[PDB]
Amino acid sequence: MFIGTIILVLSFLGFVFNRRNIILAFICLETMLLGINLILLRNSVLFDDISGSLFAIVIIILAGVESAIGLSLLVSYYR
Amino acid sequence: XXXXXXXXXITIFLAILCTIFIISAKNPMVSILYMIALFVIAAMYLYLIFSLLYIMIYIGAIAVLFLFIITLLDINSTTLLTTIGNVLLTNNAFILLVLAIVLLLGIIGPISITMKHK
Amino acid sequence: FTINFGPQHPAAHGVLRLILELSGEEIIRSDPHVGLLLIEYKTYMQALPYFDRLDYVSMMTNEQVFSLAVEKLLNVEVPLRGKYIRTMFGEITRVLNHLMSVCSHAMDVGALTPFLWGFEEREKLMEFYERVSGYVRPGGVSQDLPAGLLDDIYMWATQFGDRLDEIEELLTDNRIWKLRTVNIGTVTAQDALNLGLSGPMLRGSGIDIRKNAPYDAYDKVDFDVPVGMNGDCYDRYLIRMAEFRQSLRIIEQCCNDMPAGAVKVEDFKINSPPRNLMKEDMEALIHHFLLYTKGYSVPPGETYTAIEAPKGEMGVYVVSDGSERPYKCKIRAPGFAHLGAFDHIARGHFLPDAVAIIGTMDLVFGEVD
Amino acid sequence: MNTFIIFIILIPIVGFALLFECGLTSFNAFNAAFILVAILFLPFDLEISTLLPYVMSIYLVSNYGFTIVLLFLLILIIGFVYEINTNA
Amino acid sequence: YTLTTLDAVANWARQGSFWPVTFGLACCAVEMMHVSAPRYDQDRLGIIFRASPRQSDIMIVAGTLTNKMAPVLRCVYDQMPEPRWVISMGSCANGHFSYSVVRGCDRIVPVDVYVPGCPPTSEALMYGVFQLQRKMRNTKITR
Amino acid sequence: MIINIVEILIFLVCVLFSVAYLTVAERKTLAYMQRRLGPNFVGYYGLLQAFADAVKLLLKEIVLPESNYIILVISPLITLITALIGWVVIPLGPGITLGELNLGILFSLAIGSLGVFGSLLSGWSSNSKYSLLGSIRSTAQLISYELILTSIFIIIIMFVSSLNITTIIETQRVVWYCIPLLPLLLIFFIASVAETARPPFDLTESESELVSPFVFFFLAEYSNIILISAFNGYLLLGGYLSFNYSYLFNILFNDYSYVSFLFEGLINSSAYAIKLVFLMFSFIWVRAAFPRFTYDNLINFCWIILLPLLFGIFLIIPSTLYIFD
């Protein structure tokens, strides 16, 4: 909970301290998705039984789609 | 007893150091390796199944893709085990169908973005 | 994007420094350059053992074309048993060259077993190379065949052919070997004639100096027409593999006379063959020693007698001013036609495809120069 | 005090880890439809990896809804190869 | 010291496991092909050192040598590791004289054992290999 | 915990020795097919070849003249860890190796992705020069067949259920190997030679553009052979499962209770060794009788034919299980 929140914070600050990079922002967005999941999974175990862990897998699929989509976008760019 | 298991809060001490290392790292090559290490730190925190679920997809595919794009595109600048399937396949079956739909776009999107076919 | 295809060891040993400008995802822009590697200075007899060192494998067949070229310039060349020891041995050294070429292709194209199976059979042919020689001379041959030459051919003739069908059955009946060789090889026939190709390098599509206008004793022995369907590397290999069986079917149909007959060449001059009675027949010693010291003179005139060897068109341009040794000697070899045909043919394939081209094209560093 | 200890195979690895250019022309490529194969691995790997929990949770559910997901993904591999192929 | 054996234990393992590089140039290359075939399949086994030559320690110069091939042979020895040994196979490398072909490979790379012949037989190169194996064992004495 | 520290050591010693010895075994078996002979001079029996090759490279020299000379040495270490950590989850009986983890199957899949990750760090060092784009072709070939193994994994779990490797072996007791999957067994063997480095597919990754860590790369390579070979065994072949129905008859004749005479743990291991050694042997004559593929022909064989084929197999596997249940 406190771990995932701090990961989200540092990544959001690191995003707004990009230094033009572009590639750094993609890494940062992925770690923000990881940060949200860890606090949700902690809540899922705190509450008990599958409900939150279900939405955690949903974020994992959407993040994987987000990464595959954003990386293909870089390929469309830099011709 | 088990002082190292109680002091296993070291995950937050390691994550703050790892994330500050992804920003500080010159060249993306080191930053992606540190993203893998940060995801491995988060996997070690999921021991405190999702660890192996993360290593297989986030480190296994996402991170592999993140390294595959930088090496090629020059760019640069300085009773059952947790189940889940019981709800997603029965109750949230509408979301299961839409997750296949979000996966249609996942492969069809790049096909209409980087093609140039005759 | 540009790369230099192996500074050494490209396919088997090569040496060739092929500057292949490998454009985006391998499309090939060929720039070979290479062509790396006395015949005038040395006498007519001295030039012959120095000549065979071009194509190392088919060295005996490499000797044959130069021996015939000196024969045409001399205008004196009629052996009988000394002519029988040319068609037999010429179709024995043909097995040797075709082995190295097919094996060098298979070495890089995965299959390492036919590569070693090739060199294994070669050791049985080494007895036919060491016991007889230690070979092909303009005035016949270096020396006479031993008693254990014709008496024991069946030990090779029957044991080989079945082993030929072990290498063939491992390559022709495939998917991996078949799909690649069928696609590669840009034998455009007319442009391939314009590029000056020869032997299994030009008769793959279905187009021969070995037949029609044949060189010494090859005229009488039977030779079958190698078909060849398409103009690709698979048909090229099939032709070489058909030539393998052709090189064996001849030996049994050519197994005639051999012990006791025509020694080398009959007269005083052009390599004296007495051996036993050279001391009693001493009036020819002034001739015998003169061939080694100064050397016998040849008439002046431009001559070119091309002969199709196992690799392809090996042609010698022996031109003499009138002296003992010829003025200029030119070697129009198929290994030099290799680098000449590499561009346009390989242009439109991939980098691992560009290695399998050499196997069918046949390359020898020595023969190139 | 610990169970199985995988680190006892990592420690000897850490210990062992501790204990002009010529011949060719270089210094100076974009393979185009090759990055798309990797870009496609991510969702295709996700597709089979997401099936894993539904595969584990069988003999409790009705497979008709379980089959539907795969049909949608079959339409995709078809919607890819028939449209542009592997790009030779 | 008594345990002088440890200096030779590495040597006996070096001479039996050594990986030679195929620097096949012309005629000697295929005599070496017959060597590396069912003959030297027991203790030789080494090849493929073009990809390197940081890997493999024994350099066998087999074949002819042109005046333009001189910077290539020099570089292979330079790209080779510190425990490097050299074998000169063939008359062209040993000493064939031309204006387009250099007189000797010794001017380019210093050779440890010279193998004569034109071409040296399967047994000829194999013996030259065993002589270099003896040199690795620290027993190089004037015969 | 002296009981556990000795138990791991004897397993690790035998595994590393078997991995090293296969380099001599492959060399000798390929020699018999080629009509030649393997190593003879080395050792006494000709079996000390592997150690002599390893000791030779331990003396060698440094590769100091660099492009992150720490990252270039990181790859052979990462390939070694994944190989050895892969072995801690391959049991053969009730609990032969301590990694009797409550989700054993996924441990093998989590590692099979890292063997790809470490591969693009290898040929990465020293710029775009010496084909970095040629080294990336190998890793793109790697991910393609990595999807095939995972698609076959879920197929086995679709038939037996539960993520435990021990439970997978226990269910297959009736039919030895997963019999309604014979073409899929050959497909997993074709993907076994494709995923790891065996001449068909190793030639495409190590023979193209002019092509201490050598004792590692080859150790992890040979480890990856036996790892994926035994790995194939528990999924399909069916290790432990020696004689059927005639097993209980022989055991109960002269044993009385059970005694410290644990023959159970010996017969099973001897059967599994044969299971993987027969696959290892099959991995050796494929070096001999096979030519070579082209990169574009590799992906065309996987993504176009192998992937939609397997898609159909797992699509009908629950529908054919729907009728009989």
Ligand code: SF4
């Ligand atoms: S060579 Fe010498 S001896 Fe002989 S013929 Fe002439 S002079 Fe008489």
Ligand code: SF4
């Ligand atoms: S003549 Fe004698 S000296 Fe000359 S090469 Fe022949 S062998 Fe050597």
Ligand code: SF4
């Ligand atoms: S030495 Fe004689 S054998 Fe070797 S290449 Fe030179 S010419 Fe050939």
